[PDB]
């Protein structure tokens, strides 16, 4: 291969340009085991993007120049081969085939070339298609005879879509699994890469930072992979140190990770133990009133996270029973923003539309050949995208029996089988079920007799199966809100729009007489404290638009509104 489409990794390892490859030695030995074969000496590094597939080959190219190769791979000039640059420039017939036969002629003359084709899935249909002169069919004769040594690097998905699907190419290539490193393996990688990133940034990097880079990237980043994600934290923190300047620490990694996810450095640089020690006071910030509920779930999460925890249970299962919209999904959002630092972790499934077991095949995915195969079965993109999550099952009493027979897995194990065959882990997810099985007192202070908390408890036993209810951690019951409890919610929500008023130098001069009437109008004992915000926008914000209807802007108008008494 010329130095036109690739790069001599063997000559890069002579000049000490390749990064040290710590670990992955079972894989470098496996690649040598494939390359030492007589025929079809062609390994494929199958992994994920960033697990160190190129690093295995960089570690192999170091093992060639250090003489650690078994007199079949000695003095093999290992070249990469960018097939993307090799396709690039083919707008005419025969351009790609000419640039590939020049490479293939160069390997024939020298006889000591090992190709490394990153993205070997590109080989299929690189020229035109499968049955056509592509890069696959050009290389297939010499790959089948061991006369072209080629290290591939696909992912597991791309190996199955392109190499296993292509008949007469799955045989030419030998799968070498490069798994994602563990966190303790990644710390050993970072400590081996310590001298490279200390010398580049001229910034000392401590052992506290490299443990923090591997641990927090596995937790907070779940679209990328360990080796890379954690190196990128070490690399970006050393780079942002250069734009501040001598030492990268635990807190410096949490800052450059907080700029990616949006978690405040504090929620990254914390300590589960303290992290959940002042849990109650931070969950009061968006739940005022119904305080025994907050202290119950704050106690339950601190039991089922801190200290002992089996890995065969979720972080907490909850039944939120009681009156609707009094803080039911408002607490679960407040728990999700406490969970690891992101409010965007709450998922409403809205089980009220389900009154069918056939629609459970439209919730957990369809059997293939049926409708509901793409949307439905979307739990892959949600909960194994985010192992730290909160799933809310609103109105579970509306659903069919067969729907939560499939939910008996996730309370026992913490795993779920998708309709497309995925392991959708509910392992760290706080699952929360929800039923307004209580509406009797709710429906006026009368009942079925001739004349609270335990009325809705035995309605769960009446409606559901006891097999489902007892795996659930704690059942939380909400009560009717006192008028002193409602006006604090009015106080919290009138202050939300008040910040948008002084942006325009307007001021809603607050009075408590209007706040009592908002509590009367924005609450009923069937639905209340959910339509309180529409009561705010219909009764306050309609009449504050009458200011600019009669054109009141000025430097600022101190408006005070009070509607009549009821």
């Amino acid at each position: 291969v010329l130095d036109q489409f690739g790069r001599n990794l063997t000559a890069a390892a002579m000049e000490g340009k390749l990064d040290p490859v710590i670990g992955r030695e079972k894989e470098i030995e496996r690649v040598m085991q494939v390359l030492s074969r007589r025929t079809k000496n062609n390994p494929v590094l199958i992994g994920e993007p960033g697990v160190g597939k190129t690093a295995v080959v960089e570690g192999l190219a170091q093992a060639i120049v250090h003489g650690e190769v078994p007199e079949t791979l000695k003095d093999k000039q290992l070249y990469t081969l960018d097939l993307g640059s090799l396709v690039a420039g083919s707008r005419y017939r025969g351009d790609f085939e000419e640039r590939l036969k020049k490479v293939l002629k160069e390997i024939n003359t020298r006889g000591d070339i090992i190709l490394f084709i990153d993205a070997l899935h590109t080989l299929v249909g690189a020229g035109a298609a499968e049955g056509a002169i592509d890069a696959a069919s050009i290389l297939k004769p010499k790959l089948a005879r061991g006369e072209l040594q080629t290290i591939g690097a696909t992912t597991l998905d791309e190996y199955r879509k392109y190499i296993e699907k292509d008949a007469a190419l799955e045989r030419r290539f030998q799968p070498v699994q490069v798994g994602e490193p563990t966190v303790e393996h990644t710390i050993e990688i970072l400590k081996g890469l310590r001298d490279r990133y200390e010398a580049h940034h001229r910034v000392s990097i401590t052992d506290a930072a490299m443990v923090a880079a591997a641990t927090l990237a596995d937790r907070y980043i779940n679209d990328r992979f360990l080796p890379d994600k954690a190196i990128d934290l070490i690399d970006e923190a050393g780079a942002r140190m250069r734009i501040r300047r001598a030492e990268v620490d635990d807190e410096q990694i949490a800052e450059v990770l907080g700029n990616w996810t949006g978690i405040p450095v504090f929620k990254l640089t914390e300590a589960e133990t303290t992290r959940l020690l002042r849990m109650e006071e931070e969950l009061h910030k968006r739940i005022i009133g119904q305080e025994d509920a907050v202290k119950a779930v704050s106690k339950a999460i601190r039991r089922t996270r801190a200290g002992l925890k089996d890995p065969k249970r979720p972080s907490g299962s909850f039944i939120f029973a009681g009156p609707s919209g009094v803080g039911k999904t408002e607490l679960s959002k407040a728990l999700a923003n406490f969970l690891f630092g992101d409010d965007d972790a709450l998922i409403q499934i809205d089980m009220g539309e389900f009154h069918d077991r056939f629609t459970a095949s439209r919730l957990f995915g369809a059997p293939p050949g049926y409708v509901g195969y793409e949307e439905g079965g979307q739990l892959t993109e949600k909960v194994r995208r985010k192992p730290f999550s909160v799933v809310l099952f609103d109105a579970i009493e509306k659903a069919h029996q067969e729907i939560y027979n499939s939910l008996l897995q996730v309370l026992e194990d913490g795993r779920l089988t998708d309709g497309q065959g995925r392991t959708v882990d509910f392992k760290n997810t706080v699952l929360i079920f929800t039923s307004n099985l209580g509406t009797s007192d709710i429906s006026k202070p009368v009942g079925l007799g001739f004349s609270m908390k335990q009325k809705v408890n035995d309605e769960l036993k009446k409606h559901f199966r006891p097999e489902f209810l007892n795996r659930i951690d704690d059942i939380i019951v909400f009560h009717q809100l006192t008028r002193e409890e409602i006006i604090r919610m009015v106080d919290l929500m009138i202050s939300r729009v008040a910040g948008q008023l002084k942006s325009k130098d307007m001021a809603l001069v607050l009075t408590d007489a209007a706040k009592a009437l908002l509590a009367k109008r924005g609450f009923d004992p069937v639905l209340g404290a959910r339509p309180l915000r529409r009561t705010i926008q219909r009764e306050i914000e309609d009449q504050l638009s009458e200011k600019i209807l009669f054109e009141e802007v000025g430097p600022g108008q101190v408006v005070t509104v009070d509607v009549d008494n009821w």
Partner: peptide, 24 residues
């Protein structure tokens, strides 16, 4: 109940040979 997933065949062809203009 069933859905058939069809298969939208794309038009894919090899690159065009060109004819050259000569400059002596």
């Amino acid at each position: 109940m069933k859905v058939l997933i069809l298969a939208c065949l794309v038009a894919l062809a090899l690159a065009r040979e060109l004819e050259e203009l000569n400059v002596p």
